[PDB]
Design a protein around this ligand. Structure first.
Ligand SMILES: *C(=O)N1C[C@H](NOS(=O)(=O)O)CC[C@H]1C(N)=O
Length: 251
């Protein structure tokens, strides 16, 4: 049941698209089909998968797990501490997740992405987009070789959270816990992660909010994506749009 829908009023003039999928009744709701099928860098939404990779390989073990902060100075106050998994996920702490993933061999990551059908599964540029000058604050998931479409994001979220992967249930529940967000509506449970990048080649943002919604027995897996040319459009802004869509059409 694939419905093409018009969520444009919630996008308040920003270029983008949305896809919501309920796998129980296979009701696919799509705004801007062309964009929803286009692969792009996942940016910080990759933290959903890298958290699971780290748990499966034992690099981390719980919401409390630390990565051994070494005292390096960062402009974000909250990166300058021995933060837990839960805090690094919510702060999108790049050094924590870079150190995590660099403890994992490339073959293991390749095979996990292949199993998840995670877009092009292209980790060939492991170091990331070094031409931006940011050095070790870079990786294959940040405007680099790995690309995934919004529709594929939803398919991956569904496989993970419906229990259809080999990841341990314990590890899925840790991810659920740390992705939960507060939308000031107790009648829906929303979970997700933002991502922000700028596509230098095409001069457009990659601004993401990916996650799931639970509303009384029904679950929707969703991905909201902007490709606007305005650099002010970030992941957090697209999360605002996503929340407005959820409150208008999914309450
Ligand atoms: C992930 O996309 N990133 C890490 C960090 N958080 O992004 S978020 O607020 O959209 O979740 C900063 C932006 C980006 C990056 N430049 O690495």
């Amino acid at each position: 049941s694939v419905n093409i829908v018009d969520y444009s009023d919630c996008f308040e003039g920003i270029s983008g698209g949305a896809i919501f999928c309920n796998t129980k009744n296979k009701e696919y709701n799509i705004y801007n089909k062309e964009l929803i099928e286009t692969r792009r860098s996942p940016c910080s939404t990759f933290k959903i998968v890298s958290t699971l990779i780290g748990l499966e390989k034992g690099v981390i073990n719980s919401k409390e797990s630390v990565m051994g902060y070494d005292g390096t100075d960062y402009p974000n106050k909250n990166w300058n501490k021995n933060l837990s998994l839960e805090e690094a996920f919510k702060e999108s702490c790049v050094w924590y997740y870079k150190k995590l993933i660099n403890k994992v061999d490339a073959k293991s990551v390749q095979n996990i992405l292949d199993d998840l059908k995670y877009g092009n599964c292209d980790i060939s540029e492991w170091e990331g987009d070094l031409k931006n000058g940011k050095g070790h604050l870079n990786g294959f998931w940040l405007e680099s070789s790995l690309q995934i479409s919004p529709k594929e994001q939803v398919q991956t979220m569904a496989k993970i959270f419906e229990g259809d992967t080999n990841f341990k249930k314990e590890h899925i529940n840790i991810l659920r816990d740390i992705m939960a967000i507060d939308v000031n509506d107790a009648n829906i449970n929303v979970y997700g992660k933002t991502g922000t990048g700028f596509d230098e080649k095409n001069k457009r943002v990659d601004a993401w909010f990916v996650g799931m919604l639970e509303r009384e027995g029904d679950t929707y897996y969703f991905a909201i994506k902007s490709d606007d040319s305005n650099k002010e459009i970030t992941g957090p802004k697209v999360k605002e749009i996503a929340i407005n869509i959820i409150k208008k059409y999914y309450s």
